[model samples]
Target: GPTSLCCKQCQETEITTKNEIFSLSLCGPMAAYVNPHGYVHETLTVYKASNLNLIGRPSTVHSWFPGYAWTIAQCKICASHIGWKFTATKKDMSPQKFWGLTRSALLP
Candidate 1:
């Protein structure tokens, strides 16, 4: 069976399906990040996503992946925050960009 991950707020706003998810040696498919500001962000890693929007400039502050800058990612339909878009800060890095989607924000 195919599993779809949609926005929890709008349930219809599909973000990505299980087929799009991939695991990393470091974070695997899902990882928990402790935000310095507060709270633990449990996220799902995926190679691509749809019905999503990126907000703000990429920043390296407390980046979960060291050499990657993170930008806020939100649902395009409901405008509810969904995750962070991580882009490689160095040219030599593999996987130039990837998404870290909040597990709580998605209706899996």
Candidate 2:
């Protein structure tokens, strides 16, 4: 079934479950860690939140935990913060491709 994941702050459609949407176990509070710059970063870690409407800016970054590269996802509408999109920078890394979207910010 397709689920419409919308912005919790504003009822705006963020990402729909129709597009092969799925969740991951590493998107909890334990996944919240600080970057080298002493900034605490976190997200739900979605596989394909890149196409989300109002999703702005794709900043490529490194995942120290999962050991991969990805982009910082954001909500363009209210700019209320979103999640992350993991990228596979290496071919040898046999892992399914996806973006780690922040599930908390999404609506039920």
Candidate 3:
């Protein structure tokens, strides 16, 4: 069965099950100084699908301590929170290709 995943930095911080969709908040305190217009920013998110067969996988994956599969989304907006999108695909391929196949949001 497939499971949902979330990113802590993002405000919503919830994973979508229908299509393995992950979101990242693009706005934050720093955003006020950067993009006050409340628009999506140039950021990146790296998402890895879980392999149940693999051992020692971290539980509560959103924990910021360490060994977490998530990374910073690099919010480029002026608000304190802008959302980001990601697709589930092989690691060997670039996000552009994978996301293109999934018809996800446009890549920077």
TM, every model? 0.81, 0.56, 0.19
lDDT by residue (1-108, candidate 1, tens digit) is: 248889999988889889878764454236655334423247788888888888989999987766789999999988999998889998987688888889899987
Q: Cα deviation of 78 in candidate 1 (Å)?
A: 1.1
lDDT of 3: 0.29
Q: Which stretches of candidate 2 lie over 4 Å from their true place?
A: 23-45, 50-65, 94-96
38-67 in candidate 2: lDDT tens per residue?
A: 122444444455334334444344454354
> Which candidate number would show the highest lDDT if scored against the true structure?
1
lDDT of 2 at 44: 43
Where does model 3 exceed 4 Å of error?
A: 1-18, 30-33, 36-46, 49-108
lDDT of 3 by residue, 19-102 (tens): 534454433447544333322223233343221122232243432212123222222322222222233233553333111012
- Clashing residue pairs, backbone N/CA/C < 3 A, model 2: 44-102, 45-100, 45-101, 46-99, 46-100, 46-101, 47-98, 47-99, 85-99
lDDT ranking of the models: 1, 2, 3
Q: What is the C-alpha RMSD of each candidate to the true structure, in Å?
A: 4.8, 6.3, 16.2
TM-score of candidate 1 to 2 decimals:
0.81
